[PDB]
Write a protein that binds this ligand. Structure first.
Ligand SMILES: Nc1ncnc2c1ncn2[C@H]1C[C@H](O)[C@@H](COP(=O)(O)OP(=O)(O)OP(=O)(O)O)O1
Ligand SMILES: [Ca+2]
Ligand SMILES: [Ca+2]
Length: 1122
DNA sequence: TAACCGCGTTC
DNA sequence: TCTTGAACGCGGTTA
């Protein structure tokens, strides 16, 4: 066992040891390993109650190693809650395996005989299996690839086999030995083509192959787990959510080496607790209540403990008592868990021994028996909030519907002494926000996703949405006996017309800014209808209205009883627009947007990677390349120069110290070529890279195995369910008298939840599109991605061509159009059936959908109708539909400050309600914008509603515009300094650490440097640094990069403040230290200026209005036009 | 100037 | 190791 001459003895011993500690920890938390009783009877699912075993709700799984009870045996532990409120775990053992592919299927026995002997040391078993290969000729006729399936006792032996085979695999494509040159059987090694399914994580392999999912109920029996399809609802796990608050020096981050834990707030199954560190918290806190809304009950019991070690002993003892199987936190992986771990180490406690939590290979904290649900991981991936709204406060407002307690971090340590009850109140607010966010958003979503994705809750919360897509597809391939492709790898080098490409992609979404300014439900607009368009709509009308009834409402025209009246109402309204083209009336503010655009384009056209090759449907995409201007001549020039040079060894642990170019990896060579071809091309030409768009054509086989596209259709439908439930409940709130309140607040709460669930499905669904372009994708197709995008572009431009003939489109982006139609354009109508029921009709929506189905329907969709005889039918598939929302009270579109340009992805929209309907792209939404423009925008957009005329509204908005410019002209204020610095500060997140930006300049890089010089180097040691700065006046003539002054200096001791200010301002004589005298008011004038222009001034000129805010000047390009 | 970058949006 | 995509706005810096 401990023989130091054995391969992998130290790794085997340790991996078995870790399994033994986990078995010991699970046992303490009430997860004994349960072996079901012996039963040698019928192994069927019906009469489940006859078969002995234990019923459980599956709450977790982990890979492990068991001993035979030499090496360990690979298995997965499954963690169950039982029907009598107990818990247990059960182990399934399962040989890890991968495939060998052969080029000669006639000599499979020979390669089998070789590998059996070559892999004696690590191979266990070997077997011939067959699988469908979607790259194989005539696979559609039932022909199968023949594979050698290599099995192992554990995951290490499988990795040992991979290390032994890679030598063989490389010489088979880099060696053809010569010997007798006049000889005009082939060795068995060379028949080895490839290995397949060799990198599937073990626990995924077991979850997929055995069809087990967390979230589902099983009876554990001698023959296997048997899903109890009668068990409905999840079991109720013990859930625990905690927040810690630590001491920290003024202006500095906590450091667990020195800083103490003050308190731990937590909730368990809705009951609140607070532990206090009495060495820091001035007094015993008593049992109090925080219930911010009656559905969020917050009664807390206090444990006043004597010191930090008693606080940690209390936390740990309580966890062992309640035995939680979920523990939830907010950013607990990055802060709370590592802090507790360090304070545990310092006081001589082992956190693993106490509660079985420990850091994993990614530094995240995890246990065997208990999921760690970091709500922040759900906020980043699933909540659909902008990064500016991912804090506790904004998440709580948005999802829970209330303001949680907030406290300046600089007051938190002082307040433990001066205001312990205030701090305890805050701490307990953090626990309450966390517990209820997990219970109402994270818990249902993640545990339900587990029932279809073969991952445990920890991985289902944290894995990329691409990886979630990949897992779903891997189940479908497996269950259809489809062989998995290996992970894709980018070609190290590609050429376009003898030039070396720097980057390849495709043309994506089509987006247009057409008009700027104000549009209102009451303010009138001018139109010029194209008469042609009305004749076409009249020719299309009888088929468009039929289409509406039959396709959009799945009805029949036999049962509609007001068809001709509707047709004539619309027909009369159209005929008037043809005679009276030039009109000036009330505009109707409308939005049309295709439901699930890319997934339905994919679905409609049978788009999937394996389908890209009469089964031929030819679709176009727009390839965009970026390449070096140099020809092949000049490339071979640069290469030859590099071959005369020497290069640092990437291996420190050698006396070599220098490599030749040829000795470098192909990749590292190409990196060196790219560096050189850059600088060369700047000297023989103007530009480092030239782009070029080439339209390409691809074949989409309509017959291929549709496992990929079917998965997308399935997940689309999963999302639609919650989309309709959102609508269903938005309909119920419209039929409720404002007064009820009880029925109002239940509905408003149900709409938030189903919008949240449908939006949580949106990024995963759309990642099925992006997954074909992901690094390491098993199903990579740049063609598929380009086809989806170009088709979307063609569709949205067809829509705009119609709308701009019968109305005025304002802004268009990928699948969406904001426009104004005349008040006298046929709008909303209701059909009547022979059963008294009704059918919605928006003519402006249906006029488009009719044209979409006329022009973008796939008439070549094939489906296998008889799998035994291989009989396909062909049908017509089209699931592409515009949805209409509105009409809306007002929409305001900014304009650029450069000539004949617009702003895309930025606008505001109001209901007749007065309520803000939409706000996009604007700094007030974004993270870390100057708070002035935030608060400005936050205020000015809402006042576009007040006034009677267009000049009237542009001057009512100008009143606020001048009042905001009357804070900034004061070079100061008439309100206090604590609310000045906040109005004037700029946050700006550094995604990385300060050392990794070397050779770059920015307001952030500077603020970080200066913060490190004044408060210590360990202030910039971590990534995600918030750089809270002001920009100085001095040096007067220096780049704005310099003059980034960390606003924290204005909270520093006088002699530190003065010394650093002087050192940065380059002014040794400076005495005046007031914040009002160092601010470059010229910079902030230009930036509130440049906002007021784009939202008020330049739009006014576009809508034939004199500058309604004369304080701000028009640019020269505009003024030389007026 | 023209080209380019980092952040954080809208799709 | 793990890793969805492109298009765009804004304020920056560099040969
Ligand atoms: N996060 C994303 N990842 C990849 N593609 C995306 C993403 N968001 C949007 N897209 C692409 C694919 C979508 O079909 C298209 C239109 O986006 P959008 O209209 O916001 O959503 P959608 O049309 O898919 O759903 P819906 O309109 O029903 O909310 O843009
Ligand atoms: Ca907190
Ligand atoms: Ca859409």
């Amino acid at each position: 066992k401990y023989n130091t001459l054995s391969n992998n003895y130290a790794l085997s011993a340790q991996q078995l040891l870790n399994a033994s500690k986990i078995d010991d920890i699970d046992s303490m938390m009430g997860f004994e390993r349960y072996v079901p009783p012996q039963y040698n009877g019928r192994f069927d699912a019906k009469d489940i109650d006859q078969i002995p075993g234990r019923v459980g709700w599956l709450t977790n799984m982990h890979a492990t190693l068991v001993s035979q009870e030499n090496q360990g045996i690979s298995g997965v532990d499954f963690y169950f809650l039982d029907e009598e409120g107990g818990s247990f775990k059960s182990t399934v053992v399962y040989d890890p395996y991968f495939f060998i592919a052969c080029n000669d299927e006639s000599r499979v026995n020979d390669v089998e005989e070789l590998v059996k002997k070559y892999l004696e040391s690590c191979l266990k078993s070997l077997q011939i299996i067959r699988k469908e290969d979607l790259t194989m000729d005539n696979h559609l006729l039932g022909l199968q690839k023949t594979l050698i399936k290599l099995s192992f006792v554990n995951s290490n032996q499988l990795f040992e086999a991979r290390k032994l085979l890679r030598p063989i695999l490389q010489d088979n494509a880099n060696n053809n030995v010569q010997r007798n040159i006049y000889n005009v059987k082939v060795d068995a090694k060379h028949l080895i083509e490839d290995i397949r399914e060799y990198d599937v994580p073990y626990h995924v392999r077991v979850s997929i192959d055995k069809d087990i999912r967390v979230g589902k109920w099983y009876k554990v029996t001698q023959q296997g787990f048997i899903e109890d399809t009668r068990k409905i609802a999840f079991a109720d796990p013990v859930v625990m959510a905690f927040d810690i608050e630590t001491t920290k020096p003024p202006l500095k981050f906590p450091d667990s080496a020195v800083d103490q834990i003050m308190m731990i707030s937590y909730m368990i199954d809705g009951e609140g607790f607070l532990i206090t560190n009495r060495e820091i918290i001035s007094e015993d806190i008593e049992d109090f209540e925080y219930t911010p809304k009656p559905e969020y009950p917050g009664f807390f019991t206090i444990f006043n403990e004597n010191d930090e070690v008693a606080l940690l002993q209390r936390f740990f003892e309580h966890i062992r008592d309640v035995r939680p199987t979920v523990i939830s936190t907010f950013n607990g992986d990055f802060f709370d868990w590592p802090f507790i771990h360090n304070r545990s180490k310092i006081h001589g406690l082992d956190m693993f021994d106490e509660i079985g939590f420990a850091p994993d290979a990614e530094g995240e904290y995890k246990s065997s028996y208990c999921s760690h649900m970091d709500c922040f991981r759900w906020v980043k991936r699933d909540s659909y909030l902008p990064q500016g709204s991912q804090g506790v406060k904004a998440v709580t407002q948005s999802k829970l519907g209330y303001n949680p307690i907030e406290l300046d971090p600089e007051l938190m340590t002082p307040y433990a002494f001066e205001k312990p009850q205030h701090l305890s109140e805050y701490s307990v607010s953090d626990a309450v926000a966390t517990y209820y966010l997990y219970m109402k958003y994270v818990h249902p979503f993640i545990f339900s996703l587990c029932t279809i994705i073969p991952l445990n809750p920890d991985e289902t919360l944290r894995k990329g949405t691409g990886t979630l897509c990949e897992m779903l597809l891997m189940v479908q391939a497996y269950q259809h006996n489809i062989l998995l492709p290996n992970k894709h790898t980018d070609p190290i080098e590609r050429f376009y017309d003898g030039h070396l490409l720097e980057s390849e992609t495709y043309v994506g979404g089509h987006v247009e800014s057409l008009e700027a300014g104000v549009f209102r439900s009451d303010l009138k607009n001018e139109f010029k209808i194209d008469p042609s368009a009305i004749d076409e709509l009249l020719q299309e009308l009888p088929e468009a209205l039929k289409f509406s009834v039959e396709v959009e409402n799945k009805s029949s025209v036999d049962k509609v009883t007001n068809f001709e009246e509707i047709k004539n109402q619309i027909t009369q309204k159209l005929l008037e627009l043809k005679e009276n083209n030039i009109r000036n009336e009330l505009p109707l503010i409308y939005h049309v947007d295709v439901a699930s655009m890319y997934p339905n384009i994919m679905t409609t056209n049978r788009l999937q990677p394996d389908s890209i090759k009469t089964c031929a449907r030819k679709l176009k995409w727009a390839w965009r390349g970026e390449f070096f201007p140099s020809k092949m001549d000049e490339y071979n020039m640069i290469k030859r120069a590099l071959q005369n040079e020497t290069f640092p060894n990437k291996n420190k642990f050698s006396k070599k110290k220098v490599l030749t170019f040829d000795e470098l990896s192909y990749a590292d060579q190409v990196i060196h070529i790219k560096k050189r071809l850059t600088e060369y091309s700047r000297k023989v030409y103007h530009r480092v890279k030239v782009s070029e768009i080439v339209e390409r054509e691809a074949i989409v086989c309509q017959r291929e195995n549709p496992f990929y596209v079917d998965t997308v259709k399935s997940f689309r439908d999963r999302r639609y369910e919650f989309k309709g439930l959102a609508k269903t409940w938005k309909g119920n709130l419209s039929k409720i008298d404002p007064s009820d309140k009880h029925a109002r607040d239940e509905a408003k709460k149900m709409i938030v939840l189903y919008d949240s669930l449908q939006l949580a499905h949106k990024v995963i669904l759309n990642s099925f599109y992006g997954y074909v372009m992901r690094k390491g994708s098993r199903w990579y197709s740049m063609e598929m991605a380009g086809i989806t995008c170009l088709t979307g572009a063609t569709i949205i431009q067809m829509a705009r061509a119609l709308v701009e003939r019968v109305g005025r489109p304002l802004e268009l982006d990928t699948d969406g159009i904001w426009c104004i139609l005349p008040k006298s354009f046929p709008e909303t109508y209701f059909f009547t059936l022979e059963n008294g029921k009704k059918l919605y009709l928006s003519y402006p929506c249906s006029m488009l959908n009719y044209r979409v189905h006329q022009k973008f329907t796939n008439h070549q969709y094939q489906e296998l109708k008889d799998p035994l005889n291989y009989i396909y039918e062909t049908h017509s598939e089209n699931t592409i539909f515009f949805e209409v929302d509105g009409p809306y009270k007002a929409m305001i579109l900014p304009s650029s400050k450069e000539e004949g340009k617009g702003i895309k992805k930025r606008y505001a929209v109001f209901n007749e309600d007065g309520s803000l309907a939409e706000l996009k792209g604007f700094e007030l939404k974004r993270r870390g914008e100057l708070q002035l423009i935030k608060n400005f925008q936050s205020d000015i957009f809402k006042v576009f509603l007040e006034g009677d005329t267009l000049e009237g509204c542009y001057s009512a908005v100008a009143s606020v515009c001048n009042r905001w410019l009357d804070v900034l002209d004061s070079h100061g204020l008439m309100l206090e300094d604590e609310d000045l610095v906040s109005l004037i500060c700029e946050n700006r997140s550094m995604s990385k650490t300060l050392k990794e930006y070397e050779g770059q300049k920015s307001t952030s890089i500077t603020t970080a440097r200066r913060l490190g010089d004044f408060l210590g180097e360990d202030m910039v040691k971590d990534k995600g640094l918030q750089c809270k700065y002001i920009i100085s006046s001095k040096p007067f003539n220096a780049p704005v990069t310099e003059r980034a002054i960390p606003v924290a200096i204005f909270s520093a001791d006088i002699p530190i403040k003065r010394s650093f200010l002087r050192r940065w301002t380059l002014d040794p004589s400076l005495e005046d230290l007031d914040i009002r005298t160092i601010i470059d008011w010229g910079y902030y004038r230009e930036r509130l200026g440049s906002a007021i222009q784009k939202i008020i001034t330049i739009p006014a000129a576009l809508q034939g209005v004199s500058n309604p805010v004369p304080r701000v000047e028009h640019p020269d390009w505009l003024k030389r036009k007026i």
